[PDB]
């Protein structure tokens, strides 16, 4: 039961995120359609990934709310179960998505004459729906247990409680193991294959392959840089708990960079649309097309 400062952080970090992020995800989105026309699959999970970040997007507000009224949740019992379900569930679904978009084009480059029936648009959009669906049920946990977390600070406390329950520490060592470095290590991995592939092309010369490994770095150091305070934060609170519940101890002083690390994450919704639509040549000249087509 102790309280930190962390209302001028988050709460303007997430209205950064949500208007450059909105215009950004539509852009992606669209050039995702435009490239589905195309019987290019890659822009199923193109639009897999964008229509997470515009959930994730729309759903910000009740969290600025959140932290902006000094943690006073007063929309309701059964707002925080949806909107807070949307809000600590689309991370997981656009890093799923990620994944998919590295290991689709590892296929496709190392492979380029094999693995025809896997890429087409069909089994894209049978991925997408076995994605949401594996994802939304494995996160569905913290559905039925109602919250109802209020305590004598003057909080309201919507979807978190200090400290943890049995149950949302085990859900948060999944919620790191399989949601965060799972997905991050076959993303590596992709994507160390398709750099892999490129020093034996001929055809491309020696700038394009270091113009490739940018990008093929950055992509991979961004989830860090979006995604790793915050899950080394909830690892190591949820390991407090385990050898020690009753000690409010570590959860004294952590907690302000942990709703830091938590707003922190929130940047993988504008730096997935950079990397995926607009840094691109060929993708850029859809989008200007779109905004010339208004």
Known sequence: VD???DHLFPPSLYIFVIGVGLPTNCLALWAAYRQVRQHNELGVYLMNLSIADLLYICTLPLWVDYFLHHDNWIHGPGSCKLFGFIFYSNIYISIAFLCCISVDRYLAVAHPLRFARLRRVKTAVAVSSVVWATELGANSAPLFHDELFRDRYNHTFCFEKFPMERWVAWMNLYRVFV?????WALMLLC???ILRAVQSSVSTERQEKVKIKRLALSLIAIVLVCFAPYHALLL??????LGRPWDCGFEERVFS????????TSLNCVADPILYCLVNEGARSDVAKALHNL
Do not use: E
């Open 191 to 193: 994507y160390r294959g």
């Open 236 to 241: 190591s609170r949820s390991a407090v708990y």
């Open 179 to 183: 949601g965060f470095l799972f997905p």
């Open 257 to 264: 960079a942990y709703h830091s690390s938590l707003a922190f």
């Open 3 to 5: 309280s930190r400062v």
